[PDB]
Structure formats: structure tokens, C-alpha cells
Amino acid sequence: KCPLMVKVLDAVRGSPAINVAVHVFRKAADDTWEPFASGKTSESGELHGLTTEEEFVEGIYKVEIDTKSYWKALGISPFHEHAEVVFTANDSGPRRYTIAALLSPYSYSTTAVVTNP
């Protein structure tokens, strides 16, 4: 439904992650990660308000999820400082990309779903 939907689940409490910071960047022509969007992970573990179709142009994007502090909040010292997903968007036309994240104290995984209208 959305051109970019990133959401986070927890593998310890079996619940979507709560209060996890998200930062989105884009690769500029000079290879600089200019900020592109930001937000906070909702109680449902999903992030929205990132972008619309009009400003989502072809190029290289990067999604960053702040996992390091989230585990300190719950009293566990984690491994990763954050999680980063880098992908090409709208290479051959408008698509719909879904990004998933299954965190853990010392692990995570990422998947992608492309609607290809």
C-alpha cells in the first residue's frame, strides 16, 4: 500500500517493538547520506509517515533502526548499535517496498516484499 513500510518485531517478548527510533537517509550525487525521513516505532511495531510517492525518486536509500538504546531501556546489553537496510528503489518504475526487522539482543533479520504494480 505504501512505497516504503518498515516495521520491527521482537523475538524475546514475542511482541512488536515499542519506542524504537528510526532514521531514513538517501544517497546524494556526492555520495553523502543526506537525511530523508525519521520517526519512532509505534506500539504496533510499525513505522509510517516516512515518505510519499511524489518525493520517492529513483536512487539508493538507507533505513536505520536504533536498537542499541532500545535494549538498554529494557535492561539488556545488546550487540548491534543499529540495523541498516540499503536498497535500490524505483529502478524500472513505481513499486511498493515492504521492509521487515526481527530483532533480538544479539541478532536480527531483514526481508523485502515488492508489489510490482
Ligand X SMILES: O=C(O)c1ccccc1Nc1cc(Cl)c(OOO)c(Cl)c1
Candidate list 44, 52, 88, 109; residue touching ligand X; CB under 6 A: 109
For 6-30, b where at least 16 C-beta lie within 10 A, e where not — what string?
bbbbbeeeeebbbebbbbbbbbeee
Q: Grid coordinates in use for 18?
A: 515499542
- Regarding 17 and contact with ligand X (CB under 6 A), the answer is no
Q: Residues touching ligand X: how many (CB under 6 A)?
A: 7
Q: Grid coordinates in use for 95?
A: 513499486
- Regarding 102 and contact with ligand X (CB under 6 A), the answer is yes
Q: Give 1's DSSP letter.
A: -
Candidate list 6, 9, 17, 37; residue touching ligand X; CB under 6 A: 9
Binding site for a second copy (CB under 8 A): 9-16, 60, 68, 76, 78-82, 84-88, 100, 102, 104-116
